[PDB]
């Protein structure tokens, strides 16, 4: 849906004389701007409580910045996604430096493997995998081995003119 930000979004249930100060629910929402995030907030609240944006109020909207944006983290992810023939929960694992970077390639993955456009996916939970060997998925586990190294064989250099006088070398 774009390059993502994360948003604390807080809203409540409009006041009534008989019930002033209603109950205040928060959600974290991944959106590309604050207008989507508020629409998205109201999308889920109508899926849980009896409210709709008309009868309710957004109390506050705040961006959440990654706590340690230069530290590599292993993320487990929890997703509910409609498919053509029916809806299914999932758990994937994503290794990256920010929750926002994580959510970005999640949505990219759900589109490439499962053909799921943004409207189908629900983010259920994203949380930092704390101890390793709570990493459960082999494509991440590959990258946790001690003293890891790999070559990048068959290197391809982008040419800047239509002709070359040499002959390329994929050496590296």
């Amino acid at each position: 849906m774009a390059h993502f930000k994360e948003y604390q979004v807080i809203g409540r249930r409009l006041p009534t004389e008989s019930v002033p100060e209603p109950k205040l629910f928060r959600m974290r929402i991944f959106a590309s701007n604050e207008v989507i995030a508020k629409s998205r907030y109201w999308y889920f609240l109508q899926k849980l409580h009896k409210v709709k944006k008309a009868s309710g109020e957004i109390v506050s909207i705040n961006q959440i910045n990654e706590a340690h944006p230069t530290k590599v983290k292993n993320f487990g992810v929890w997703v509910r996604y409609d498919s053509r023939s029916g809806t299914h929960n999932m758990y994937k694992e994503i290794r990256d430096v920010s929750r926002v970077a994580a959510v970005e390639t999640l949505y990219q993955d759900m589109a490439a493997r499962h053909r799921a456009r943004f409207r189908s996916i629900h983010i259920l939970k994203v949380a930092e995998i704390e101890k390793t060997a709570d990493v459960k998925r082999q494509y991440v586990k590959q990258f946790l081995t001690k003293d890891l190294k790999f070559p990048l064989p068959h290197r391809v250099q982008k040419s800047t003119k239509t002709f070359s006088y040499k002959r390329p070398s994929t050496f590296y």
Partner: protein, 197 residues
Amino acid sequence: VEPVVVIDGKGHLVGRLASVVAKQLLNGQKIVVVRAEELNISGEFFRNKLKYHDFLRKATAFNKTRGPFHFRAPSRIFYKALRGMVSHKTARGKAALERLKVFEGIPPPYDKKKRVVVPQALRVLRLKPGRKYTTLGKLSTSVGWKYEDVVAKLEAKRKVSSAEYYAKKRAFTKKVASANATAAESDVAKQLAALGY
């Protein structure tokens, strides 16, 4: 850049060579292509064999002469890929097509001239290593091109003389690098260094 550009066909993907060759002539750049028999098509030999036979059955039912013409030579397989990328029924297109020559092997004058390469058509640069591909000379001799052996014969001879040539040349630029070494450390040399040379 240069009046004529000679392209070693060897190692290039047909549709991506044709694609750039086409645009160059339309911009007025003369081109000659050599060694079209060492040209490559993506996909295994059998696919492009069938693909050629699909092409091969199209003909004018009432007279097979007016119908589509099927040229078997690797150069002409290439010139067909090219012509489809040029509006060849305009005068402007016939113009551009005339700035083109395609050759099996490297005949005279072009043999002693230098030939260049097109990195965005280079097979080794584009295909994922592990895809299967085709060589134009194999495919053409399959569909009736008569001359693969004579070309390969002449080439391997031409290839041997050009090694004599090169050997001498690497032996002359051995001296040139030697005389260039004495000149190093002199005033001329040290000043040129500072100026980037």
